């Protein structure tokens, strides 16, 4: 586990006395010494830290993960962790994770995420937070993944995740985890309720209807809104994503099909609710035959 007891050869652990270092800082130092020889325990100042112009392969402890000294070390790509990692790792009697990337804390220690349907700036931001809270991130999906982060429903990854019955959650989960982390309201990712960040079955879906009786039309209006979708009374290009229609006839249907709008039966809508995720549209095309 921890360094005196770690299977790996001894390395130098170097705390950074910023004066910007918090109480967690001193707590980390006291608790680390129980498994580390004072000799392999150094303390560095900003000037000393800037003197280091290469990757020392030593473990650096910095709070905050910002400033001239942190940017510098990280630019070299040296192992860096926050005081909370130390505390968590000593206390739990486990070795500190190799810091491929700086790790601030272990709030998301046991979590492995992958992303789908997100702005490039968002995904990037989501990766940064997760890695800083001790999580893993797989570009592609696999069984190891514990949680999928989605901005909308529908993508191929979304459907795979959904078939494997894995949690599909909003980026707000990550944001909220990091906020309550800094505010010291949270210690583990299991602290906040995950359900509250569940991705709506119809998130991103703007649904229109045609050819349906008033009862079924109302029902899909009610249910669309209730499952995070947007309902529209009138089909409009560049807006509607789904046109529920039983037959491949009528001016609306032809317009949607031309606009690359999903034309599906009511079965798509209802199976989606029954199954707990946005079903695959291909399985439900209004016009089954290629042609």
UniProtKB/Swiss-Prot annotation:
Residue ranges annotated for the BRCT domain, each copy included: 103-191, 197-286
Stated induction or repression of this protein's expression: Up-regulated during the S phase of the cell cycle. Up-regulated by E2F1 and interferon.
Tissue: Highly expressed in heart, brain, placenta, lung and kidney.
Subcellular location: Nucleus; Chromosome; Cytoplasm, Cytoskeleton, Microtubule organizing center, Centrosome; Cytoplasm, Cytoskeleton, Spindle pole
Modification(s) after translation: Phosphorylated on serine and threonine residues in response to X-ray irradiation. Ubiquitinated and degraded by the proteasome. X-ray irradiation reduces ubiquitination. Deubiquitinated by USP13; leading to TOPBP1 stabilizion and activation of the ATR-TOPBP1 axis pathway.
Entry remark concerning the domains of this protein: Some BRCT domains specifically recognize and bind phosphoserine/phosphothreonine marks on proteins. BRCT domains 1 and 2 bind phosphorylated MDC1 and RAD9A. BRCT domain 2 binds phosphorylated HTATSF1 and TP53BP1. BRCT domains 7 and 8 bind phosphorylated ATR, POLQ and RAD51.
Sequence similarity: Belongs to the TOPBP1 family.
Subunit structure, interactors included: Interacts (via BRCT domains 1 and 2) with (phosphorylated) MDC1; promoting TOPBP1 recruitment to DNA damage sites during mitosis. Interacts (via BRCT domains 7 and 8) with (autophosphorylated) ATR; promoting activation of ATR. Interacts (via BRCT domains 7 and 8) with (phosphorylated) POLQ; specifically binds POLQ phosphorylated by PLK1, promoting POLQ recruitment to DNA damage sites. Interacts (via BRCT domains 1 and 2) with (phosphorylated) RAD9A. Interacts (via BRCT domain 2) with (phosphorylated) TP53BP1. Interacts (via BRCT domain 2) with (phosphorylated) HTATSF1.
Function description: Scaffold protein that acts as a key protein-protein adapter in DNA replication and DNA repair. Composed of multiple BRCT domains, which specifically recognize and bind phosphorylated proteins, bringing proteins together into functional combinations. Required for DNA replication initiation but not for the formation of pre-replicative complexes or the elongation stages. Necessary for the loading of replication factors onto chromatin, including GMNC, CDC45, DNA polymerases and components of the GINS complex.
Name recorded for this polypeptide: DNA topoisomerase 2-binding protein 1
Name of the coding gene: TOPBP1
Covered residues, full protein: 1 to 289 of 1522
């Amino acid at each position: 586990g921890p360094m005196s007891r770690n299977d790996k050869e001894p390395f130098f652990v170097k705390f950074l006395k910023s004066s910007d270092n918090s109480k967690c800082f001193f707590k980390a130092l006291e608790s680390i010494k129980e498994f580390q020889s004072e000799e392999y325990l150094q303390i560095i100042t900003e000037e000393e830290a800037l003197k280091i112009k290469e990757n020392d392969r030593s473990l650096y402890i910095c709070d905050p993960f910002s400033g001239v000294v942190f940017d510098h070390l990280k630019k070299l790509g040296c192992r860096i962790v926050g005081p909370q990692v130390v505390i968590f790792c000593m206390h739990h009697q486990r070795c500190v994770p190799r810091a491929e990337h700086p790790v601030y804390n272990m709030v998301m220690s046991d979590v492995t995420i992958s992303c789908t349907s997100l702005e490039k700036e968002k995904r990037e931001e989501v990766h940064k937070y997760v890695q800083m809270m001790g999580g893993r991130v797989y570009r592609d999906l696999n069984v190891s993944v514990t949680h999928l982060i989605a901005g909308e429903v529908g993508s191929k990854k979304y459907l795979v995740a959904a078939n494997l019955k894995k949690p599909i959650l909003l980026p707000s989960w990550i944001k909220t985890l990091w906020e309550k982390s800094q505010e010291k309201k949270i210690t583990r990712y299991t602290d906040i309720n995950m359900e509250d960040f569940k991705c709506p079955i119809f998130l991103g879906c703007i649904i229109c209807v045609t050819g349906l009786c008033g009862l079924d039309r109302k029902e899909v209006q009610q249910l669309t809104v209730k499952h995070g979708g947007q309902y529209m009374g009138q089909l409009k290009m560049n807006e509607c994503t789904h046109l529920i229609v039983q037959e491949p006839k009528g001016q609306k249907y032809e317009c949607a099909k031309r606009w690359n709008v999903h034309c599906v039966t009511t079965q798509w809508f209802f199976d989606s609710i029954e199954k707990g995720f946005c079903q695959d549209e291909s399985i439900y095309k209004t016009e089954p035959r290629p042609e």
